[PDB]
Structures are given as structure tokens and as C-alpha cells.
């Protein structure tokens, strides 16, 4: 770092971050998501509509922001819609908390008041348990619950994506009591429409498939990054291609060498060779005759997905597999995935933990936007598995916490009296984020929600009914939340907010 003086980090650094955070979740949160352009070190267009992703990609130069980054990342694992919340609740509380400081309120006196308010907020949340639904045998129930999560993360086809994520997540384990984070793995294959994406189960290798079939039930695999150019460690790993005379004997010789390799795996157990290494011209010929599958050209990502599920372990050497390097899948077969030929394995009773949604788009640009919707939606299913408490649609949750917190200023006083009040406004930052998206007055949005006085129903979503004002029931629309989502978000948000607010000058020479 660099040196600082006059307790600058508290007044100055805290508000710089607030803004940096702002408007990358103050318009890509709620019922319509919005694209932001991120260019990475290998430059390409990348559209983000998700809070956790855009921060991983950014290099945080502010030390004030970095705390807040970590808490968003916990929330990415845990909810995938409490991740959008960390930023907006946290930034807003510091802006308001700065105002209090000027009056003379001490930094910790306010921190007391935010903490009794948070415990209190959590007491209100069982009054914001409005209806309970949970069928994990029904695609129909699941899709409505995910629907507000994926909405925030996409501007596209909301309804169609909701059926694909629901179909994957239910179908894999409809009797599980807990679900996994890498239970669904993405496969990102080029071509076709967005609404031409589909659902398979088990591992898909998105890279080239060759050999020739020979089984559809015996799906034993052995995983290598070791090439078959002429690399074998049971004998010598040297090639002879630097001499013209030898190179010719070697081309002819590669045929027989390849037969030794293929058998060497298979006999001890394989039917499909997983090969991150490369398969020569002559090599490709011997496997076609012999009739063992090849899944050629596998990058590190492709091989790791495979290893983690089956417990097959890769080496850069080729020797017959021991049992720890052997995996098994319930099935394999060769059929097109989205209308492109690949290998599809099945897992849904072997160990599950890998389903595949094929993300399609004639360009990689269309795919990233749907990558965010599914990946966040994995972890939203993991909340609905654990509990059934159903929390109304976005932004309709937020009003009631604000109304009962205002009561909390009046009944408690102290020097915490002020802090509690700004805790109240700070939950209103979330529908003010929707007012800022809609581009109409903040104040008018807030006015309608208090006037009808409905608490757990009414909010201004993103519509053309949000342009000339109206209010709508987000309790009944297929836009629902869950209890734990909000319980986690708030807890880690208040964790993050308070602790940046403590900071004082960096002392260095």
C-alpha cells in the first residue's frame, strides 16, 4: 500500500468503494437483468449480470472494497441472489452512516445500533414467511421459485431458461435433503438458438469425440493428459522423427505402438479412453479398427470435471491403470447434444453430482449471459431443498423490514436511536435500486409501497407499468424468494459493512 494520514480511510476510501460497487447491481438486480461489459486480460466481450463474477474479474485497488468482495463470494456459494444484496445493502448503509458522523456520532456508537437492528430484522423475517411451497419431485413448483433469481441474471428468455434449470436440478435427486454447488456443471457448446438449449444428465465432453463405439453400458474410463504421439513410460518415451530414414519406420511403427497402448488401458478396465493428450494420424487409425472410443483434445477443464465425479486420476505417464485411476459411470452413448455430436455419460445413481445443461448460442457472447443464470440457480435450488419457507418476490420483502425498524428507533432511544433509523432507509436502498433502474423518481416508488401499506405484496418491479407508475403483487406472479436467502445475505452484509466502517489510516513510512 501507500501512506495515509488524518483518518482518511474512513471518510474518503469508504465512499470511493460505494460508488465503484453501485450501478453494477443497482440495475441488474430484480425482475430484469442488465448487461455490463467486462474485457479480460485475453480481451474478449464478456457480459455480466451477476455480482460475484464481475468482482472476481476486477482487480480491487481499494482495500475498503475487498472485505465486501469476500462476503459476496460466500453468498455466491450459498444463495445466488443474496450475492446481489451484499453490495447494495452495504454501500447504502455507509453513505448514510457518513452523514451521522458529521453530527458527532462516534463510529462504534452507530455500530452498536446496526447490530441490535440486525438481530431485530431477523425477528421480522418469520412475519415475511408468506405461504410455503416445496416439491422437489415437481419441475412446476421449482421453476417459479428460481424465476426471480434467473430474472436478475438475464435479460433474455426468462421463462424457457427456468424450465431447463428446473429440469436438471429436480431430475438428478428428487429425494435428497441437501444438494451440491457443483451438482450441475455447465457445458458450453457453440451453435443454435438460446431457446435451443437442452438438458442431459452426467458428464458431457464438449471437445471432439472419435474412436468407434463398442459399449453402451460398460462406461469405464481412464484419464490422462499424456499424449499417444509416442509417449509411453513402460518403455521409452522418446520419439524418432528427426531423421527421415527412421521417421518412415516410425510412422508404420506407430500403428503397432498404439495397439499396445489401447490394450494396456482396456484390459485392466477401459472402454472409453479419456485423452487430454493428442492422438496422431496413425494413432487415430489404430483406435478406429480396434473399436475403442476416444474423447480426444480434452483441455484441463474437461479432464478435471471428469476426475472429480468418478475418482479417476490423471498423470502425464501411460502405464496400466491401478484402481484409483479407474472410474465408472452408469452409462455412455453417442448421441448429439443440441445437434452437435459429443459423448454423454450418465450419472444420476452412480454418485450424481454432475448434470449437464448445454448452453447454446451461435456466438460465446449469447452463452455467458445464460451461464450466470444457471450457475447462480444451482445454489438457489440448494436453499429450496433445505427449507420450504417462501418469502415474497423481490423488493416486497424490503418495505416491511423498514416500517418495523422505524418503530425500533422510537421504542429504543439512546445514541443508537439515529443508527437504527439509517438501518431502516438502508433496506429501502434495494427498491430505490429498482427506481434507479426504472428511471423514475425514487421517492414516488417508496410513496406507493407505504400508502397501500402492504407489506409482503406490493413493489414496483421492472415493467412498462414502472414507467408510468403502478404497483403489483409480486407475492403471486411466479416471483418468489426463500427465507434463508435473505437471512444469509443480511448477516454477511452487515458483517462486511461494519468492518470497513471501523478502518483507520494505513501507517507506513
Amino acid at each position: 500500500a501507500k501512506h495515509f494520514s488524518g483518518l482518511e480511510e474512513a471518510v474518503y476510501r469508504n465512499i470511493q468503494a460505494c460508488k465503484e460497487l453501485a450501478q453494477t447491481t443497482r440495475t441488474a438486480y430484480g425482475p430484469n437483468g442488465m448487461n455490463k461489459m467486462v474485457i479480460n486480460h485475453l480481451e474478449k466481450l464478456f457480459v455480466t449480470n451477476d455480482a460475484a463474477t464481475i468482482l472476481r474479474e476486477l482487480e480491487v485497488q481499494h482495500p475498503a472494497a475487498k472485505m465486501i468482495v469476500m462476503a459476496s463470494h460466500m453468498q455466491e456459494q450459498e444463495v445466488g441472489d443474496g450475492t446481489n444484496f451484499v453490495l447494495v445493502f452495504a454501500g447504502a448503509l455507509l453513505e448514510l452512516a457518513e452523514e451521522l458522523l458529521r453530527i458527532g456520532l462516534s463510529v462504534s456508537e452507530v455500530i452498536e445500533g446496526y447490530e441490535i437492528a440486525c438481530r431485530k430484522a431477523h425477528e421480522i423475517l418469520p412475519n415475511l414467511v408468506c405461504c410455503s411451497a416445496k416439491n422437489l419431485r415437481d419441475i412446476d413448483e421449482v421453476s417459479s421459485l428460481l424465476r426471480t433469481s434467473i430474472m436478475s441474471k438475464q435479460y433474455g428468455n426468462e421463462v424457457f431458461l427456468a424450465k431447463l434449470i428446473a429440469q436438471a436440478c429436480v431430475s438428478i435427486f428428487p429425494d435428497s435433503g441437501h444438494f451440491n454447488v457443483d451438482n450441475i456443471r455447465v457445458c458450453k457448446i457453440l451453435g443454435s438458438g438460446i431457446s435451443s438449449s437442452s438438458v442431459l444428465h452426467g458428464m458431457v465432453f464438449k471437445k471432439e469425440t472419435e474412436g468407434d463405439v463398442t459399449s453402451v453400458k460398460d462406461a469405464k474410463i481412464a484419464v490422462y493428459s499424456c499424449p499417444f504421439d509416442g509417449m509411453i513410460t513402460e518403455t521409452k518415451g522418446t520419439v524418432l522423427i528427426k531423421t527421415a530414414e527412421e521417421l518412415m519406420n516410425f510412422s508404420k511403427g506407430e500403428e503397432n505402438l498404439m495397439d499396445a497402448q489401447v490394450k494396456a488401458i482396456a484390459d485392466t478396465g477401459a472402454n472409453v479412453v479419456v485423452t487430454g493428450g493428442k492422438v496422431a494420424d496413425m494413432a487415430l487409425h489404430y483406435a478406429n479398427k480396434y473399436n475403442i472410443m476416444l474423447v480426444r483434445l480434452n483441455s484441463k477443464w474437461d479432464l478435471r470435471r471428469l476426475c472429480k465425479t468418478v475418482g479417476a486420476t490423471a498423470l502425464p505417464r501411460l502405464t496400466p491403470p491401478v484402481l484409483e485411476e479407474m472410474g465408472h459411470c452408469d452409462s455412455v452413448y453417442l448421441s448429439e447434444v443440441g445437434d452437435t455430436q459429443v459423448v454423454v455419460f450418465k450419472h444420476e445413481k452412480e454418485d450424481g453430482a454432475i448434470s449437464t445443461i448445454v448452453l447454446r448460442g451461435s456466438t460465446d457472447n449469447l452463452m455467458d449471459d445464460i451461464e450466470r443464470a444457471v450457475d447462480d440457480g444451482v445454489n438457489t435450488f440448494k436453499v429450496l431443498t433445505r427449507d420450504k419457507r417462501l418469502v415474497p418476490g423481490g423488493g416486497a420483502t424490503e418495505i416491511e423490514l423498514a416500517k418495523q425498524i422505524t418503530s425500533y428507533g422510537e421504542t429504543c432511544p439512546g445514541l443508537e436511536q439515529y443508527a437504527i433509523k439509517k438501518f431502516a432507509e438502508a433496506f429501502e436502498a434495494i427498491p430505490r435500486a429498482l427506481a434507479e433502474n426504472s428511471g423514475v423518481k425514487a421517492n414516488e416508488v417508496i410513496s406507493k409501497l407505504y400508502a397501500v401499506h402492504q407489506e409482503g405484496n406490493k413493489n414496483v418491479g421492472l415493467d412498462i407499468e414502472a414507467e408510468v407508475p403502478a404497483v403489483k403483487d409480486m407475492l403471486e406472479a411466479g416471483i418468489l424468494d426463500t427465507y434463508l436467502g435473505k437471512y444469509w445475505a443480511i448477516k454477511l452484509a452487515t458483517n462486511a459493512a461494519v468492518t470497513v466502517l471501523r478502518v483507520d489510516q494505513i501507517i507506513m513510512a
Binding site: 500500500a1 475498503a64 469476500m70 456508537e109 513410460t233 471501523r502 501507517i507 507506513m508
Partner: protein, 513 residues
């Protein structure tokens, strides 16, 4: 080259010293605030702990070196109070400045500090009173000692936990912990938490289907290196650099593996019978799959990944002695732990050893997924274990939260010396230096810093009461009745270390480039 002489030169030293203390003024009590420190190495250390902040990086001055040197002395003995130290030295200097600037000598102020200080050590011996070494009394000190280091919430979680660590001595009373330090750190759901595990816990463990999960009669043999190579205590080389080399390394691991396992199964039979008691083996390196199958089936619990730091502690706890080879060892020299059980939480395995023969090791398990949380909670534990440790050793403890500061100041009563008045300057400056501790709590809290202090002086006038500024509301109170007391060791070593440092600053009137 350049040389600054006389009172001009002394200014250059004291002004710097005062400015460091001003920055750190923000810290102290829980109504203080964490300070963000970034050295030149990245990473956000969020520490309010003064000792950590002085060492990792701090403002360059000559006096930067002095505030750290005394921080170093304080921490090592007592292991609390390094925030506290900073602020009194500062306020002493302020007072000393007013007189020299009038047209007085640095040296006469200095001598009067020595007279002043000596009366104050003697003041401690009266004001102190014996309090229990029973668990709940130590809660009330632990609650206070944790609060001067770090924030309120962080202080509250650790109170009960830290007390149970230091209580599990053998009636071995020292100021510091030496072997009850074990740091285990975990990225977990709970954002901040500390768990009490009594006895020494092992870094990771191996588990097999046939292995004994619950073991009630564990004869530990502690081994080091390894089942990969016979006759070793440090690792052997490797062969894989060529294609041909790979095959060889794996093939002769069969011989190495084959020699080792034999030793262990024959020793198990002497000690346990067949399977009638349980046997624990400590691998500090890789465990080969072939050996995991045989040991596990047999009734032998293999453990994978232990430290050299576990190895030292394990020996004291079980009564066994270390071996660095997997070989036979006499039943006598094996340790006994009467319970071993493995709790698998998150992605790590914590295997406990409980029923410790000799408890001088305990383990605190730090939760915190985030880097920012882990650094807060973990660094509070260390200064916390040693704080409470001072209290159990100490037979007498002193009332706390500025209780003693205001008493000493009034008693030391102006116009008591008459010798030359050289003593008068010092005894007068030292009165106001002590009263920094009220002042900084009052600054942190509502109302004006001196406004709360004059009410403390007034209540102090009423005898039968030691009155200071609360840590949790910044108001006047009888400290004693609330329970907020601080160990003797902090308060004794404070006086010696503050006087010497600030004495030397005034002695410096030549600073050479």
C-alpha cells in the same frame, strides 16, 4: 553530517513521538476501532492490537523504533497492554513540553519522573486485592483483557473459551502460555466462531471403511517418515525425470512398503491383543494405498498429515516419546490417550485426543471463511490466552478500566515535594499522563474527553470507591462492582516500561545524521 543541538533538537524527537501516539489513539477499549494495515506484501490485516501494528509497518521516525522496542518487552512478559502503553508515554511528553518551552531543562523533568514513578509502584501494592483463581472470577478479567485488544462482539465469543484453556493447567502458573498455543484455521460456514477442543488436535486424518472411528484405549506410537521408504527419518530422493525413471520409483516402493507394515502389526498384538484395544499411528507424510488397506483392516488407526508442531505437543499429552521411523517400540514408552475420535467438518478432518494424561495443550479451532474475519478472531486468541494466564499466576489483581489511574494521580498531591522543585515538575506531569486512560475512553464515547474525567475525580473523592470510565458506555462507575478488573501484570510492567522510554527521549538533545 547535520546536527541539531539543544531544545531545538529535542523538539524533533518529542513531536514525532506524540504524533504516533495520536494515530493509535483511535484504539483502546471496545469503543475503539480496528485499524487497517497493509504492509508492502498485500493482504488486509485488520488489527486493533498495537503490538501487531508497530511490527508489520509503521511511520518512520527514530521514535518509531522506541515505541516498538517497549511494545516488544511488554508483549513477551505479559502479552497484553501494548495499546495501553503508547498513550501514557505521549501524554507525559506533552506536559514535559510546556515547562521546557517556558525555559527549563529537559533533565529536571526526567529526574522528577523517577521519583514520581517509584511512589506509583508502591501505590499498586495497596490498591490491589486478592481475588479468586476460580473459573467465573477469571471470566470477569478475561472479558476485560479481550476488550482492550479487540472489538466488543469479538471479545464476547472468546471469554468462556479462553478461560477453559488456561484452567486446564496442572497448577503450573506462569505469565504466558507456551504449549497451549495451537492454531487451527478453517474456512467454514460460521463467519466468526471459536470452538473449544480440549487436548491436542491433529491437523488432518485418514479414514477407511474398516478403521475404528471410536477408540477407547489408544496406544499411540508417534512416527514421522514414512511408509514410502524404509530406514528413513528424512525423505529419500526420487526418480521420474526420464520415462524409464518413473517405472522404477513405483516398483521399489513395493519393497519399501513390504518391510514397514510388518513391524506395526506385530507390535499391535503385544499391546492390544488381537483387536481388543486400539492402536494409533502418526504419519507426518504420504500414506500409500497398499498400507492404508492393511493397517485399517487390522484395527490400527492411521492418521495422515500431522506437523512437527503436533509432534512436540503429542509427546507431553500422551506421555509417549517420539520415534521417527515406523518400527517396533516397547509398550512402556507408548503414550496413552483414553479417547481418540474424528470429527469431519467442512473439508478437513480434526482428530482429537482426549483424556490427556498431562494437560498443557489445548486447541482452539478458528472458523472464518473470509481472510478479513480470520485475521481478527485468530490474533485476539493469542493475546487473550496470555492475558488470562497472567491473572491465574498473579495472586492479586488490580481494579480496572482507569480505576487506579485517578487514585494514584490525586494522592500524589501537588506541593508535596519542596526539595528544589526538580521533583515537582515530574510529579506534576506524571499525574496528567495517567489520566490519558479516562480521556481516550471518553473520546471514543459520547460527551467531551475532560467532561467525563472531572466527574471521575469527584466520585474518587468519595472513598470506598475506585471510579473509572466504563468500557461499554463511557460513563462513570464503581469498576469493582461491575467486575471490570485487569490483571496485576499489565499494571506493574506498564509503569516500568513507560517511564524508561520517555525518559530517554528527553535525554536525547543531539541527533546526528
Amino acid at each position: 553530517a547535520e546536527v541539531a543541538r539543544a531544545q531545538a533538537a529535542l523538539a524533533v524527537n518529542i513531536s514525532a513521538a506524540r504524533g504516533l501516539q495520536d494515530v493509535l489513539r483511535t484504539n483502546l477499549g471496545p469503543k475503539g476501532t480496528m485499524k487497517m494495515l497493509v504492509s508492502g506484501a498485500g493482504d488486509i490485516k485488520l488489527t486493533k492490537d498495537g503490538n501487531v501494528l508497530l511490527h508489520e509497518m509503521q511511520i518512520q521516525h527514530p521514535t518509531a523504533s522506541l515505541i516498538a522496542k517497549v511494545a516488544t518487552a511488554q508483549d513477551d512478559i505479559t502479552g497484553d497492554g501494548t495499546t495501553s502503553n503508547v498513550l501514557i508515554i505521549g501524554e507525559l511528553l506533552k506536559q514535559a513540553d510546556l515547562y521546557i518551552s517556558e525555559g527549563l531543562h529537559p533533565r529536571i523533568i526526567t529526574e522528577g519522573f523517577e521519583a514520581a514513578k517509584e511512589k506509583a509502584l508502591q501505590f499498586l501494592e495497596e490498591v490491589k486485592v486478592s481475588r479468586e483463581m476460580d473459573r467465573e472470577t477469571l471470566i470477569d478479567v478475561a472479558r476485560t483483557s479481550l476488550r482492550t485488544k479487540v472489538h466488543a462482539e469479538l471479545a464476547d465469543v472468546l471469554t468462556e473459551a479462553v478461560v477453559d484453556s488456561i484452567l486446564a493447567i496442572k497448577k503450573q502458573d506462569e505469565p504466558i502460555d507456551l504449549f497451549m498455543i495451537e492454531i487451527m484455521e478453517m474456512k467454514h460456514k460460521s463467519e466468526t466462531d471459536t470452538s473449544l477442543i480440549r487436548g491436542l488436535v491433529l491437523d488432518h486424518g485418514a479414514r477407511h471403511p474398516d478403521m475404528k472411528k471410536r477408540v477407547e484405549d489408544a496406544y499411540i506410537l508417534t512416527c514421522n517418515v514414512s511408509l514410502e521408504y524404509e530406514k528413513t527419518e528424512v525423505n529419500s530422493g526420487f526418480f521420474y525425470k526420464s520415462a524409464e525413471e518413473r517405472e522404477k520409483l513405483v516398483k521399489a516402493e513395493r519393497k519399501f512398503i513390504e518391510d514397514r507394515v510388518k513391524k506395526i502389526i506385530e507390535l499391535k498384538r503385544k499391546v492390544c491383543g488381537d483387536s481388543d484395544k486400539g492402536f494409533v499411528v502418526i504419519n507426518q507424510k504420504g500414506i500409500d494405498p497398499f498400507s492404508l488397506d492393511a493397517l485399517s483392516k487390522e484395527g490400527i488407526v492411521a492418521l495422515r498429515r500431522a506437523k512437527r508442531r503436533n509432534m512436540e505437543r503429542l509427546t507431553l499429552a500422551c506421555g509417549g516419546v517420539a520415534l521417527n521411523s515406523f518400527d517396533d517400540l516397547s509398550p512402556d514408552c507408548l503414550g496413552h490417550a483414553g479417547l481418540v475420535y474424528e470429527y469431519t467438518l467442512g473439508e478437513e478432518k480434526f482428530t482429537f485426543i482426549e483424556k490427556c494424561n498431562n494437560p498443557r495443550s489445548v486447541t482452539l479451532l478458528i472458523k472464518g471463511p473470509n481472510k478479513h474475519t480470520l485475521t481478527q478472531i485468530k490474533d485476539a486468541v493469542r493475546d487473550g490466552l496470555r492475558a488470562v494466564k497472567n491473572a491465574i499466576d498473579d495472586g492479586c489483581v488490580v481494579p480496572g478500566a482507569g480505576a487506579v489511574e485517578v487514585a494514584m494521580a490525586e494522592a500524589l498531591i501537588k506541593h508535596k515535594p519542596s526539595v528544589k522543585g526538580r521533583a515537582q515538575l515530574g510529579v506534576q506531569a506524571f499525574a496528567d499522563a495517567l489520566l490519558i486512560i479516562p480521556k481516550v475512553l471518553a473520546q471514543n464515547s459520547g460527551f467531551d474527553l475532560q467532561e467525563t474525567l472531572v466527574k471521575i475525580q469527584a466520585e474518587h473523592s468519595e472513598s470506598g470507591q475506585l471510579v473509572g470510565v466504563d468500557l461499554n458506555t463511557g460513563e462513570p462507575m464503581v469498576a469493582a462492582e461491575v467486575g471490570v478488573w485487569d490483571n496485576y501484570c499489565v499494571k506493574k510492567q506498564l509503569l516500568h516500561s513507560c517511564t524508561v522510554i520517555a525518559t530517554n527521549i528527553l535525554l536525547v538533545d543531539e541527533i546526528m545524521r
